[PDB]
Design a protein around this ligand. Structure first.
Ligand SMILES: COC(=O)C1=C(C)N(c2cccc(C(F)(F)F)c2)c2n[nH]c(=O)n2[C@@H]1c1ccc(C#N)cc1CC[N+](C)(C)C
Ligand SMILES: *[C@@H]1O[C@H](CO[C@@H]2O[C@@H](C)[C@@H](O)[C@@H](O)[C@@H]2O)[C@@H](O)[C@H](O)[C@H]1NC(C)=O
Ligand SMILES: CC(=O)N[C@@H]1[C@@H](O)[C@H](O)[C@@H](CO)O[C@H]1O
Ligand SMILES: CC(=O)N[C@@H]1[C@@H](O)[C@H](O)[C@@H](CO)O[C@H]1O
Ligand SMILES: *[C@@H]1O[C@H](CO)[C@@H](O)[C@H](O)[C@H]1NC(C)=O
Ligand SMILES: C[C@@H]1O[C@@H](O)[C@@H](O)[C@H](O)[C@@H]1O
Length: 218
């Protein structure tokens, strides 16, 4: 996240860090005790047997006793199309069930088909690149963004910060976009580099996939 701020510790207890040997590579969202959802582009070229699903985290540089770590048992996809950048969603079934508590909670999802209007205020978040060549964040970042339909396809939810350069970046892939208390997006792609101040950030539109999500988480 470029131009955001540190989240309050454990403000977003559905927020997940996907990790490989020495560290974070993508975000995800806890959507049931034994399932997370992320971006398909996060895992397309990675050995899922090596992925660690880290719940309850805040500062990735510290040992945090709040964390719970799972492996991935199974992946469910929904027509990921990397050429057209469509259907950028994956569900990862965990090898066990999270212990739900103050620091680890299941996200709330929208109803199937619910679109967001121009001007909806959301929060993006993640442990991705901070901009100004600062690398991956240690402390979870959040960012106020606004939904836009301009320079966006109907197959995405897009967002833009106005009046300054700010937005999601590498390593924010797969992270939730929270709008009116519900997870409406999964970070998918940027144009113009991160935080261009021109192109909106694009998210997989969670509302388009809710019946599919529900069918899996049961
Ligand atoms: C494997 O791909 C990737 O890791 C791509 C990534 C990481 N990012 C990207 C960059 C900054 C922030 C974010 C974030 F928004 F998710 F946080 C994502 C990206 N931006 N643009 C782009 O093409 N990509 C990548 C990409 C992202 C999403 C989809 C989908 N659907 C497909 C591709 C590949 C597209 N082709 C290059 C094959 C045309
Ligand atoms: C910045 O964002 C703050 C948090 O946003 C609200 O809560 C999150 C979880 C989402 O549900 C989001 O849709 C909500 O708007 C707001 O408290 C604050 O007012 C925002 N400030 C501005 C100027 O956008
Ligand atoms: C990262 C993590 O939680 N890994 C654990 C490991 O610590 C433990 O020794 C093993 C056996 O229970 O299960 C796995
Ligand atoms: C989750 C959160 O922080 N939401 C706040 C909300 O309490 C406040 O009423 C609104 C208007 O300022 O801004 C936002
Ligand atoms: C799931 O995987 C984690 C991480 O490897 C491990 O610590 C845990 O024991 C596993 N749980 C079950 C129920 O197999
Ligand atoms: C992803 C999982 O993480 C933990 C280990 O105990 C498992 O062997 C596996 O590597």
């Amino acid at each position: 996240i470029v131009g955001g701020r540190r989240a309050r510790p454990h403000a977003w207890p559905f927020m997940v860090s996907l990790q490989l040997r020495g560290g974070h590579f993508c975000g995800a969202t806890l959507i049931a005790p034994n399932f997370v959802m992320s971006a398909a582009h996060c895992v397309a070229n990675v050995n899922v047997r090596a992925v660690r699903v880290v719940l309850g985290a805040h500062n990735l540089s510290r040992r945090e006793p709040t964390r719970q770590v799972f492996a991935v048992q199974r992946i469910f996809e929904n027509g990921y199309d990397p050429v057209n950048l469509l259907n950028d969603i994956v569900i990862l079934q965990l090898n066990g069930s999270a212990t739900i508590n103050a620091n680890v909670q299941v996200a709330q999802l929208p109803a199937q088909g619910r679109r967001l209007g121009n001007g909806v205020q959301c929060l993006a978040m993640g442990w991705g690149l901070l901009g100004r060549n600062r690398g991956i964040a240690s402390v979870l970042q959040e960012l106020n963004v606004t939904v836009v339909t301009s320079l966006c396809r109907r197959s995405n939810v897009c967002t833009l910060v106005r009046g300054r350069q700010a937005g999601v970046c590498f390593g924010d892939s797969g992270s939730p976009l929270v709008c009116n208390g519900l997870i409406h997006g999964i970070a998918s792609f940027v144009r113009g580099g991160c935080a261009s101040g021109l192109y909106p950030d694009a998210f997989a539109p969670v509302a388009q996939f809710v019946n599919w999500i529900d069918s899996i988480i049961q």
